[model samples]
Target chain A: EEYIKDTSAVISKVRSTLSMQKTDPNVADAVAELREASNSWVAKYRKEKALLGKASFRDIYSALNAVSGHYVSFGPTAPIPAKRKARILEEMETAEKALTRGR
Target chain B: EDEEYIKDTSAVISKVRSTLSMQKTDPNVADAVAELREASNSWVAKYRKEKALLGKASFRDIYSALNAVSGHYVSFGPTAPIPAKRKARILEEMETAEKALTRGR
Candidate 1:
């Protein structure tokens, strides 16, 4: 339950950061913040034995990987490819739904 | 160039799976683990920092699984049993990585 809450917060932070336009002056800072938050969540929960096989965990992890990978490989101002963006958003939404169901 | 990288990654994954299948009591288990860890490190360091490759799905998936599997062996002894669920998850991640590799992701 607490994991779900924490994940929701982190996922929301990621979504908001990704939502920022490339023209935003603070986009870099926002990406840094997102990285910090997501990294914390991953380090905290990734090894949790109980959550290892959870659908929610897997989906959220996949989304995080995609987001972080993109920003790390490309600069913060680089626009996400449309297909990747759609996939990331879809993964986030699916993860939240699974979390709600306690999957 | 991409083909070579994919082929190398496939080789690493094959070694990973082969090592995992070895009997805990096998005399070669420890040596195999050491070799895998060395090869894994080399492979990761070779491409993990490459700008073009860092975001590739195949790389990310393999990285994730390698961390889990290697971290486990580091924390526990080489012969320690990986929890069934964890093993399955690692295999699934590797499978996803392979699929992504095929698609050039």
Candidate 2:
């Protein structure tokens, strides 16, 4: 229960940081679609963890990092401009730090 | 613990530089190699903060794994064929370094 909520919170933070609203309309729609897909995947991951009678936050953090990295790497059709790259890198570094601390 | 990892990585960097010196004909390759070294060192510094915060065995494990995996690309991709034996030895050293972080958990 807690883990699921935490996952949602993380997603919400990611959504806001990515600024889905501010993106071009097409890009915004694409992100919305991807969010739906990611939500489903997260649901399955949580279900599997529940079945195991144990939850590994470290694993979850790694998955989140990978998803975030992929989203940054490929989601937008346009290339990540130099300015955005710095922001994305900082976000990644922060996420990495969070996981490290949370581990 | 981070100090130990840093020491091991520094040695690895030196070894990599020595190997690169043998084929010192290409400036581009040298530049790539230097970039690779820089990235590895920077990652070590970044990961030290991670380790200090988390203090989990798997934190180091994953950190080292990511570094090892990424480092392989930087070393082998931009250059001519590195001798198989030397490559294997370097990878083995990295593996040992990774394993050290997970020791006695």
Candidate 3:
């Protein structure tokens, strides 16, 4: 619940910053809807978990990765080009290597 | 030649800005990108202040700064929480930019 509220606040702030001219009501409403949906989904997931066994860390990670994939694919934002994607991957690899080295 | 250098510098800055906008998602990458941007701007300033070899030096500085910036992006980690697709895109962009820098020389 707290995370949902915080996310809503951040979304509102972002919208306000981008639409400084009176702040678009539509944008606010959209964010509100998203917040509601997210909260409901989390609640349902929690209820299911209580009924069943808790998911393992790896399961949770896989689920989250799936969600990320869906979000990237279906979201309004266009997919980044191949060239840009490659650069981002390289950076990620570097970060991973550094982490492995305990840097 | 002066006009060409200025034009090229502006183009590079624009490319860097696009990269910086993506950096907001990763603070370490953002820091690296910011450092390179500062270096590029400093070189631009030097170009305006000095003449002769100084201009050439500034040009070289621009490329070096860009190379460092691209390297930073290429080496960013998975823990960055950025999507794999997005990360791949960034790597390609950095490689392309590095190639461009080479061609500019």
Candidate 4:
């Protein structure tokens, strides 16, 4: 249940605030969502590294988690391409599913 | 003119490597490589479509594409101040290259 909350909420929040006005309060909400989503993956991996006691995994997703902290902070405000937004949302959704499936 | 243009593009590639660290490569780093390749490849496709250098349009396009593609890869790196700033300088290097690419063209 907790994992679902951690993972699923990102998907929901991203969809709601997708391309939100830069000045909107929910834009800040979306930014927070992005940071939260990103941090989740980072924490998950940091633990894995600690458990194994080595830097084993080198997946792109690890870096993806790192970037999202600042990646989607602003939407229409600073103005990013549409594709980037789509890509960010897709990852959150995918991660959400993976978590819900108990991964 | 390999002069300014080639050097600029190479700078972009260099930063991508720094962010990925070829010696310290990971899935994200590899993706960065492939993303630039894809952008360059798409430029070729454009040339094929209409056999035009199109001035710096293709160059401009590839940089934009790659910028967005690799933007987060480097952004999400470590939290350390010095190393992150080091990585950031490389990112800034690409920003310079990107500007050169667009350069009133």
TM-score of chain A for each candidate? 0.93, 0.31, 0.27, 0.51
Q: Arrange candidates by TM-score, highest first: which order?
A: 1, 4, 2, 3
Cα deviation of B96 in candidate 2 (Å)?
Answer: 26
The regions of model 4 sitting more than 4 angstroms off are: A23-25, A49-76, B1-105
User: lDDT of model 2 at residue A34?
Assistant: 45
Question: What TM-score does the A-chain of candidate 3 achieve?
Answer: 0.27
Model 1 residue B72 lDDT score: 72
- Candidate 2 lDDT by residue in tens digits, B62-83: 4454355344433334344455
Kindly report the fnat of each predicted structure, to 2 decimals.
0.00, 0.00, 0.00, 0.00
Q: A70, model 3: CA deviation in Å?
A: 19
For each candidate, the DockQ is: 0.02, 0.02, 0.02, 0.02
User: Tens-digit lDDT track for model 2 on A1-103?
Assistant: 5444555456455444355433455554454454444544454454454334423344444545554344433434333455754455455455445444442
Work out the TM-score per prediction: 0.50, 0.26, 0.24, 0.34
Residue B73, model 4: Cα distance from true site in angstroms: 19
* Candidate 3 lDDT tens digits, A5-93: 43334333333322323244453344334323433433334434332342222233233233323222322122334464344344434
> In model 2, what is the error at residue A10, expressed in angstroms?
2.3
Question: What digit string (tens of lDDT, one per residue) describes model 4 on residues A20-92?
Answer: 7666765544554565464454455444543233211222254344334334332223434567666766665
